[PDB]
Amino acid sequence: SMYHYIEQTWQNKDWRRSILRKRLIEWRRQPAITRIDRPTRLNRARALGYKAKQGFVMVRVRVRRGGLNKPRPNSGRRPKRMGVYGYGPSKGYRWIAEERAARKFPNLEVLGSYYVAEDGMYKYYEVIMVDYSHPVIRSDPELKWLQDSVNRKRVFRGLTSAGQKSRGL
Amino acid sequence: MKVPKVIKTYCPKCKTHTEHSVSLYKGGKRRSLAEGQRRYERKNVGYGSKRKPEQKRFAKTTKKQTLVLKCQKCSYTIVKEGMRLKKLELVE
RNA sequence: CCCGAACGGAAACAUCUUAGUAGGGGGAGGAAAAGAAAUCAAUUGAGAUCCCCUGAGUAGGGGCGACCGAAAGGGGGACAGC
RNA sequence: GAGGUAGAGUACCAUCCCCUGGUUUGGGGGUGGGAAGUUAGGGGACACGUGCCUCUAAGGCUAAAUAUGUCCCGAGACCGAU
RNA sequence: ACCUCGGACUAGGGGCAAAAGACCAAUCUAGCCCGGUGAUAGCUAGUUCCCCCCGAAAUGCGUCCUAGCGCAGCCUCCCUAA
RNA sequence: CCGCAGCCUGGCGUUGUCCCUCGGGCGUUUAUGCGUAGAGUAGGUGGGAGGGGUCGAACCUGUCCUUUCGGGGGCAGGGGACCCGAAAGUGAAACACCACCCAUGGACGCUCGAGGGACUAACCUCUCGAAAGAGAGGAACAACGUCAGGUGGGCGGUUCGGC
Numbered sequence: 001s002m003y004h005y006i007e008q009t010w011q012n013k014d015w016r017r018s019i020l021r022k023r024l025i026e027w028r029r030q031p032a033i034t035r036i037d038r039p040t041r042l043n044r045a046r047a048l049g050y051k052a053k054q055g056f057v058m059v060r061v062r063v064r065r066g067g068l069n070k071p072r073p074n075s076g077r078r079p080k081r082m083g084v085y086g087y088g089p090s091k092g093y094r095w096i097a098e099e100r101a102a103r104k105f106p107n108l109e110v111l112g113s114y115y116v117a118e119d120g121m122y123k124y125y126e127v128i129m130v131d132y133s134h135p136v137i138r139s140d141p142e143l144k145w146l147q148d149s150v151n152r153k154r155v156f157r158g159l160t161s162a163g164q165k166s167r168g169l
Numbered sequence: 170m171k172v173p174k175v176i177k178t179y180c181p182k183c184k185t186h187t188e189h190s191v192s193l194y195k196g197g198k199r200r201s202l203a204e205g206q207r208r209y210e211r212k213n214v215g216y217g218s219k220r221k222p223e224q225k226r227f228a229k230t231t232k233k234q235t236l237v238l239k240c241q242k243c244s245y246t247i248v249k250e251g252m253r254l255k256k257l258e259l260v261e
Numbered sequence: 262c263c264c265g266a267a268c269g270g271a272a273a274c275a276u277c278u279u280a281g282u283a284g285g286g287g288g289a290g291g292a293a294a295a296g297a298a299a300u301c302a303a304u305u306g307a308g309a310u311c312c313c314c315u316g317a318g319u320a321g322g323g324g325c326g327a328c329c330g331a332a333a334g335g336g337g338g339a340c341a342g343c
Numbered sequence: 344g345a346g347g348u349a350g351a352g353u354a355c356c357a358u359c360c361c362c363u364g365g366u367u368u369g370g371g372g373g374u375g376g377g378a379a380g381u382u383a384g385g386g387g388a389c390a391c392g393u394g395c396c397u398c399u400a401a402g403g404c405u406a407a408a409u410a411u412g413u414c415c416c417g418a419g420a421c422c423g424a425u
Numbered sequence: 426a427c428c429u430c431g432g433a434c435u436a437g438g439g440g441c442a443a444a445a446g447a448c449c450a451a452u453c454u455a456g457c458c459c460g461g462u463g464a465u466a467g468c469u470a471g472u473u474c475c476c477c478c479c480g481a482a483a484u485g486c487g488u489c490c491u492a493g494c495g496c497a498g499c500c501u502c503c504c505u506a507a
Numbered sequence: 508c509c510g511c512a513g514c515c516u517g518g519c520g521u522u523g524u525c526c527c528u529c530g531g532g533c534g535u536u537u538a539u540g541c542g543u544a545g546a547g548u549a550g551g552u553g554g555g556a557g558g559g560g561u562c563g564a565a566c567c568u569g570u571c572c573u574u575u576c577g578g579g580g581g582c583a584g585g586g587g588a589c590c591c592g593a594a595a596g597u598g599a600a601a602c603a604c605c606a607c608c609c610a611u612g613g614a615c616g617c618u619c620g621a622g623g624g625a626c627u628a629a630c631c632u633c634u635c636g637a638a639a640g641a642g643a644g645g646a647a648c649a650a651c652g653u654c655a656g657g658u659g660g661g662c663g664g665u666u667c668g669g670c
Contacts, residue, residue, distance in 0.1 A: 001348090007351075025629075044351090048350095065373085066651075066653075072512060074438065074439095075267080075663085078510090079509085080277090082510080083216035085360090085512095085653085087361080088372050089263090093373090112402060114351090121652085122521090150290070150293090156287055157287085158262050158263080161402060165371090166262090167370095168369095207367055212277095215276090215361085217276055217510080218509060219508085
């Protein structure tokens with residue numbers, strides 16, 4: 001159970017954070033979306049069923065912090081709905097992470113997500129991303145459900161875990 | 170007006186006329202966290218105009234004066250009716 | 262599933278309501294959604310979810326103003342759980 | 344009988360905002376902190392304590408029971424060419 | 426500071442204006458079209474078969490009230506009551 | 508009547524490392540105390556008539572610091588072993604041992620200020636570089652997010668009595 005010990009170092013606070021700060025800088029040089037051949041903290045990915053068998057992949061993405069990117073209105077309005085400061089994107093950043101991530105590889109599908117690091121200017125997450133067209137996963141009894149259409153593009157309708165979380169179940 | 174400090178009046182707990190301590194009425198502290206106060210912020214949260222109308226114009230020159238009497242023999246305190254006066258002087 | 266209106270109403274109107282509707286964007290299927298409790302309720306009980314009738318304009322919210330508005334339980338439908 | 348396992352920035356907290364009856368009590372998000380984790384936790388209308396009761400999240404997935412007429416059969420106290 | 430032509434760009438609470446609140450398609454104190462929307466009218470005009478019985482007021486009080494309403498008085502119809 | 512942009516200031520986060528003077532502290536390191544009556548330094552409360560004793564004391568002789576030079580406290584040798592009383596005073600006694608508080612100073616790892624300084628590794632600006640990456644200046648500031656306060660007809664909705 002390495003996965004038990006991976007976060008034993010990094011459970012809430014460790015000097016591991018100093019190392020990641022170095023990784024934090026270099027990632028800002030990296031593209032806002034990229035592919036990593038091996039997922040970082042398997043304790044989450046395997047906890048979301050990721051299998052190192054051929055047909056899965058890992059993706060990193062970053063986003064900017066702050067309140068909602070909402071424009072000020074201009075027409076005739078009552079004061080109730082016309083303020084600006086204090087707004088926030090109602091659906092969580094954990095949710096938004098997969099969205100742009102989903103668009104990147106439409107021939108695939110999203111399952112789960114998590115962040116790994118965060119500074120005051122960006123949030124960095126990691127998302128499982130699955131090919132369903134692969135003639136490997138096509139014959140899995142353990143995931144035969146995916147052969148159906150309905151499992152597609154789910155993250156956009158909020159049927160992922162984040163979506164369920166955003167819906168507060 | 171002028172009113173003596175001590176007035177012999179009836180005391181409900183003493184059930185007769187007794188000496189008393191007389192003083193002006195003073196409002197208490199606003200005592201925040203009241204139900205009528207708690208909803209104020211819960212109504213003031215969010216964005217919109219001044220939710221509750223507030224008085225800005227004033228007509229009466231003075232305010233009603235009220236007398237407060239405390240029953241020395243049994244520590245009872247009685248509340249009297251108000252009255253409009255310039256300034257209630259408490260000197261005996 | 263995200264974003265998100267005014268018109269009017271309050272015989273005015275600014276909180277509120279009209280209302281997450283009109284509408285924007287994304288994405289499906291023939292149905293979708295949801296679906297196995299960190300559920301309830303309360304004398305130690307019931308046993309996924311959904312919809313129908315009630316519960317009920319009850320509970321509860323609001324210049325206590327127009328108005329808004331549950332749940333639990335009961336009664337029906339099919340009741341499948343890995 | 345002995346031993347072991349049992350999901351983290353997740354719960355939870357402060358604050359700002361959003362909405363719903365959720366009201367000193369709900370859910371969501373931003374922001375800041377931030378656990379325990381089986382000898383664990385949560386919940387049981389303000390808070391805290393004590394006992395008593397019941398559940399185990401932070402990953403899945405799911406038959407049916409209902410939403411509708413681009414369409415096809417059938418019926419009608421629907422009109423007879425403004 | 427001549428005039429003009431062909432191409433092209435600037436969108437509405439905006440664009441342009443050697444600036445008259447001018448022009449932006451005959452529509453300009455805020456363009457058009459479609460949808461909110463059968464919006465709001467304490468205002469204005471119309472409201473359609475017959476017979477018969479009964480049969481008013483233009484007053485008081487209150488009103489951000491005197492082009493309306495509330496409570497009265499004034500009408501009709503029904504039942505009970507002796 | 509007000510509301511919202513934008514602006515100014517400040518707080519929090521992106522926020523690092525050396526410091527530096529002083530004032531604060533945090534958990535520690537330690538050491539320093541006379542209103543009078545009295546063998547005499549009773550600062551004030553506790554358990555405590557036993558505590559020290561080759562499980563080293565009384566005595567006097569000096570080096571030394573200090574203080575209301577009152578006087579006590581720390582030094583080994585000379586001395587190989589002795590003193591306080593349950594006994595006399597004090598509105599409050601045992602320099603009988605060990606504790607708590609006030610009070611003086613320094614230091615240790617950490618925190619905050621009056622602040623100040625320095626650096627670069629964050630980050631920012633620019634350049635070179637196909638990329639990768641490199642170089643130059645500022646700088647933990649700035650800028651952004653968020654929150655608060657001040658300003659705010661720049662923009663938005665409104666009323667503008669009655670007879």
